[PDB]
């Protein structure tokens, strides 16, 4: 098994006003997006030490009672509105992974999309404050911190594609974003449940099978345990861990709108028997966001692909991913 080329890109110029320096970051994003599809964003300004500490404190203290009370509909029939947000339970002996997903904190009962019952919009559920002091405040603050980094990254992707820097970010707004955070715990288990280990076609033991990401881009922090692989024509390559950087890649919405010029890399999660954290932020636009496709390979830039509404894309992508790779 070879190792993927995953460059470490200093993204700090994307927060500034040095336009030429931003173009030099964009060039690196372009190069990575045309190669394996992944890069590490470094010098990003997020305190990832506190992110990992606060996330660990939550995973390691929530009780079974609290998990039922927060559980998504797949684990608790009483919670028919929780298709996305809430707790995703492990199944001892069968399923090792567990996680907590939350959405835009601005999705309240006031919100027009909640009042209209538009799919993919939900009001977040939270544990008891006294049982988890500071957790909700940390998690909401983190949502906006990673939103800020993601907006910067989107300026880099726009410039990389020959567009003005707001081409993506203009659709990425705090009032309507469908972006999500998932706080995933992959546990150490001895013995490890065989049912929680899948065997790939190439014989590799996996915790999550091959897929393209359902996102515009994915902005991922993981603890320092190597696990991810990306598919190339020459086979799967290992993505090295870097618990100081954010692992970035394009999702299938980007592949659609660029006429596959920036592909959505196929990736999978190797089985590793080690306690670790996986904390993705899925950069999703608003429900009615439509980006007009283009083809950077063509002199005239024209694409014949249909503009896709982001909400319909997300609803179908999340359902399909559950159908293909299982309820997480
Ligand atoms: C590879 C990581 C991103 C992570 N995998 C994942 O998070 C996988 C593959 S991208 N993603 C999903 O299952 C989609 C979760 C969407 C979320 N419930 C929501 O409502 O928005 C892992 O560690 O398994
Ligand atoms: Fe993925």
XYZ file of C-alpha atoms and ligand atoms in Angstrom:
353
model
C 0.000 0.000 0.000
C 1.535 3.285 -1.148
C 1.047 6.707 0.395
C -1.019 9.506 -1.090
C 0.580 12.844 -1.843
C -1.268 15.150 0.538
C 0.374 18.577 0.573
C 0.316 20.867 3.592
C -1.015 24.190 2.298
C -0.595 27.314 4.428
C -4.072 28.803 4.042
C -3.446 31.912 6.140
C -3.340 34.271 3.089
C -6.993 33.417 2.423
C -7.854 35.425 5.549
C -5.978 38.480 4.294
C -5.951 41.089 1.533
C -2.784 40.071 -0.338
C -4.435 39.022 -3.590
C -1.281 37.613 -5.184
C -0.575 35.505 -2.088
C -4.157 34.231 -2.255
C -3.572 33.227 -5.887
C -0.474 31.267 -4.813
C -2.639 29.378 -2.281
C -5.250 28.820 -4.984
C -2.599 27.321 -7.266
C -1.772 24.784 -4.547
C -5.468 23.971 -4.073
C -5.816 23.491 -7.817
C -2.796 21.205 -7.950
C -4.014 19.075 -5.037
C -7.580 18.949 -6.372
C -6.301 17.652 -9.714
C -4.013 15.026 -8.117
C -5.269 12.847 -5.238
C -7.927 15.385 -4.259
C -6.790 15.887 -0.660
C -4.661 18.463 1.118
C -4.037 19.559 4.676
C -4.899 23.156 5.485
C -2.292 24.424 7.954
C -1.861 27.753 9.732
C -5.659 27.868 9.871
C -6.161 29.673 13.189
C -8.527 27.189 14.899
C -7.636 25.916 18.355
C -7.795 22.196 17.615
C -6.344 21.258 21.004
C -9.496 22.595 22.682
C -11.686 20.966 20.026
C -10.224 17.545 20.802
C -10.332 18.078 24.570
C -13.953 19.224 24.709
C -15.017 16.439 22.321
C -13.266 13.769 24.357
C -14.862 15.005 27.585
C -18.301 14.604 25.985
C -17.826 11.174 24.456
C -16.287 9.790 27.651
C -19.009 11.007 30.037
C -22.370 10.642 28.233
C -24.442 7.774 29.637
C -26.751 5.275 27.915
C -29.792 7.117 29.274
C -28.607 10.376 27.719
C -27.871 8.632 24.408
C -31.430 7.316 24.118
C -32.753 10.778 25.020
C -30.730 12.369 22.194
C -30.871 9.521 19.694
C -31.744 10.014 16.043
C -34.856 8.326 14.602
C -32.805 5.343 13.423
C -32.254 4.411 17.073
C -35.338 5.909 18.726
C -38.748 5.789 17.034
C -39.999 8.558 19.342
C -37.808 11.097 17.550
C -39.300 11.231 14.054
C -37.886 14.696 13.370
C -34.258 13.652 14.048
C -33.055 12.422 10.695
C -29.701 14.258 10.916
C -29.115 15.811 14.334
C -28.585 13.904 17.549
C -26.747 10.878 18.911
C -25.785 7.862 16.764
C -25.458 4.915 19.132
C -22.901 2.146 19.118
C -24.117 -1.449 19.352
C -21.714 -3.408 21.596
C -20.738 -6.642 19.893
C -21.848 -5.345 16.462
C -21.045 -1.671 15.834
C -18.118 0.205 17.335
C -18.543 3.760 16.036
C -20.790 6.303 17.737
C -21.230 9.983 17.092
C -23.162 13.203 17.719
C -24.266 15.355 14.790
C -25.444 18.956 14.937
C -26.542 21.506 12.380
C -26.762 25.276 11.946
C -27.491 26.725 15.420
C -29.725 29.326 13.720
C -32.264 26.557 12.934
C -34.742 27.321 15.722
C -38.544 27.038 15.878
C -38.531 30.656 14.643
C -36.740 29.750 11.455
C -38.770 29.876 8.217
C -37.321 26.574 6.975
C -38.306 24.872 10.236
C -41.792 26.410 10.160
C -42.124 25.271 6.533
C -40.894 21.757 7.439
C -38.413 21.775 4.591
C -36.436 18.507 4.516
C -32.854 18.439 5.869
C -33.566 21.270 8.351
C -33.822 20.332 12.026
C -33.529 22.009 15.410
C -30.433 20.721 17.219
C -30.822 18.573 20.320
C -28.430 18.972 23.251
C -27.592 17.118 26.469
C -28.299 18.487 29.916
C -26.093 21.508 30.613
C -25.340 20.485 34.200
C -24.304 17.009 33.052
C -22.089 18.472 30.287
C -21.123 21.972 31.401
C -19.967 24.165 28.554
C -20.499 21.548 25.859
C -23.253 23.283 23.886
C -21.415 26.613 24.027
C -18.195 24.955 22.863
C -19.961 23.109 20.048
C -21.827 26.172 18.741
C -18.674 28.290 18.921
C -16.809 25.574 17.030
C -19.502 25.510 14.322
C -18.877 29.196 13.590
C -15.090 28.883 13.928
C -14.990 26.128 11.307
C -17.563 28.000 9.242
C -15.093 30.853 9.089
C -12.229 28.631 8.009
C -14.486 27.009 5.436
C -15.500 30.360 3.962
C -11.821 31.187 3.509
C -11.138 27.812 1.893
C -14.033 28.404 -0.509
C -12.389 31.651 -1.641
C -9.302 29.586 -2.457
C -11.325 27.048 -4.438
C -13.070 29.818 -6.351
C -9.810 31.517 -7.316
C -8.299 28.129 -8.183
C -11.084 27.631 -10.734
C -10.629 31.035 -12.369
C -13.613 32.644 -10.644
C -14.008 35.617 -8.355
C -13.331 34.724 -4.750
C -16.997 34.829 -3.641
C -18.224 32.361 -6.292
C -18.896 29.645 -3.702
C -18.798 31.606 -0.442
C -21.681 33.868 -1.451
C -23.987 30.832 -1.143
C -22.468 29.810 2.236
C -24.303 31.917 4.790
C -25.027 31.657 8.515
C -28.777 32.157 8.097
C -29.356 29.121 5.882
C -26.327 26.836 5.656
C -27.101 23.133 5.778
C -23.567 22.434 6.993
C -23.113 19.920 9.776
C -20.550 18.969 12.391
C -20.185 15.329 13.432
C -18.257 14.420 16.608
C -17.323 10.783 15.933
C -15.741 8.400 18.454
C -13.981 5.327 17.128
C -13.176 3.212 20.193
C -10.495 0.787 21.177
C -12.143 -2.586 21.784
C -10.622 -5.884 22.934
C -12.058 -8.107 21.561
C -13.101 -6.011 18.549
C -16.563 -6.954 17.163
C -16.175 -8.758 13.831
C -19.506 -7.386 12.628
C -18.034 -3.883 12.884
C -15.206 -4.780 10.449
C -15.965 -4.898 6.735
C -13.710 -6.622 4.203
C -13.090 -4.653 1.027
C -12.795 -6.239 -2.400
C -9.001 -5.857 -2.122
C -8.984 -7.614 1.266
C -8.460 -4.507 3.399
C -10.309 -4.432 6.719
C -12.481 -1.343 6.905
C -14.601 0.619 9.322
C -16.414 2.571 6.553
C -16.546 1.564 2.883
C -15.690 3.518 -0.250
C -17.793 6.572 -1.059
C -17.714 10.041 -2.485
C -18.397 12.744 0.050
C -21.844 14.407 0.122
C -20.681 18.034 0.397
C -19.300 20.928 -1.551
C -16.084 20.441 0.391
C -15.290 18.482 3.553
C -13.236 20.123 6.333
C -12.068 17.360 8.639
C -10.095 17.197 11.862
C -8.938 13.808 13.105
C -6.780 12.713 16.007
C -3.324 11.360 15.166
C -4.155 7.815 14.072
C -3.797 7.000 10.386
C -7.013 5.597 8.962
C -8.123 7.234 5.704
C -7.388 6.017 2.186
C -8.056 7.608 -1.197
C -8.580 5.662 -4.402
C -6.349 6.209 -7.409
C -6.077 4.345 -10.707
C -3.143 2.491 -9.108
C -5.259 1.516 -6.089
C -5.927 2.865 -2.640
C -3.254 5.045 -1.044
C -2.870 5.854 2.643
C -3.585 9.427 3.736
C -1.180 10.300 6.530
C -2.568 11.675 9.761
C -1.829 15.254 10.871
C -3.603 16.202 14.107
C -2.580 19.863 13.668
C -4.159 20.404 10.232
C -7.546 20.064 8.618
C -7.901 17.461 5.864
C -9.744 19.068 2.936
C -11.333 17.495 -0.130
C -14.134 18.128 -2.615
C -17.531 16.481 -2.411
C -19.735 15.344 -5.248
C -21.510 18.712 -5.536
C -18.174 20.283 -6.559
C -17.542 17.460 -9.026
C -20.938 18.087 -10.618
C -20.560 21.844 -11.032
C -16.986 21.684 -12.353
C -17.859 19.043 -14.983
C -15.711 16.604 -12.949
C -12.631 18.842 -13.316
C -12.338 18.724 -9.508
C -13.394 15.164 -8.818
C -14.895 14.041 -5.553
C -12.170 11.590 -4.470
C -13.358 8.144 -3.517
C -12.217 7.462 0.042
C -12.659 4.858 2.784
C -11.798 4.348 6.451
C -9.471 1.495 7.376
C -10.194 -0.504 10.490
C -7.708 0.378 13.231
C -8.089 -0.870 16.794
C -7.317 2.428 18.505
C -9.217 5.123 20.391
C -9.566 8.073 18.055
C -11.694 11.055 17.073
C -13.021 12.053 13.664
C -14.657 15.484 13.490
C -15.891 16.434 10.003
C -17.534 19.682 9.032
C -19.527 19.146 5.863
C -19.612 22.393 3.899
C -23.182 22.429 2.570
C -24.891 25.456 1.012
C -28.475 26.576 1.505
C -31.479 24.503 0.556
C -32.207 26.581 -2.554
C -28.574 27.311 -3.513
C -27.878 26.603 -7.184
C -24.400 26.978 -8.672
C -24.337 27.103 -12.471
C -21.985 24.409 -13.826
C -18.973 25.246 -15.958
C -16.125 23.329 -17.579
C -12.658 24.808 -16.911
C -11.230 22.463 -19.557
C -13.096 24.144 -22.388
C -11.972 27.411 -24.002
C -15.501 28.823 -23.609
C -16.038 27.284 -20.159
C -19.490 26.021 -21.090
C -21.052 22.952 -19.476
C -24.241 21.174 -20.560
C -24.886 19.895 -17.014
C -28.066 20.863 -15.189
C -27.761 23.336 -12.307
C -28.502 21.289 -9.207
C -30.365 22.607 -6.172
C -28.267 21.940 -3.082
C -31.119 20.842 -0.846
C -32.348 18.125 -3.212
C -28.731 17.026 -3.725
C -28.167 16.749 0.022
C -31.404 14.908 0.805
C -30.702 12.300 -1.859
C -26.991 12.036 -1.091
C -27.449 11.396 2.625
C -30.163 8.772 2.045
C -28.112 7.055 -0.651
C -24.989 7.011 1.522
C -26.936 5.294 4.326
C -28.323 2.778 1.852
C -24.888 1.994 0.404
C -22.589 2.091 3.440
C -24.997 1.557 6.344
C -26.604 3.598 9.091
C -23.770 5.036 11.170
C -14.164 10.019 6.978
C -14.851 10.920 8.010
C -15.379 12.184 7.336
C -15.986 10.166 8.734
N -17.016 9.724 7.801
C -18.169 10.388 7.667
O -18.478 11.344 8.379
C -19.109 9.902 6.565
C -18.331 9.774 5.268
S -17.847 11.376 4.588
N -20.217 10.826 6.389
C -21.488 10.501 6.622
O -21.813 9.405 7.062
C -22.502 11.585 6.354
C -23.001 12.237 7.647
C -23.965 13.402 7.360
C -24.548 13.961 8.687
N -25.285 12.961 9.502
C -25.530 15.086 8.358
O -26.706 14.997 8.638
O -25.001 16.091 7.738
C -15.416 8.988 9.503
O -14.448 9.132 10.211
O -16.061 7.848 9.349
Fe -16.015 10.845 3.222
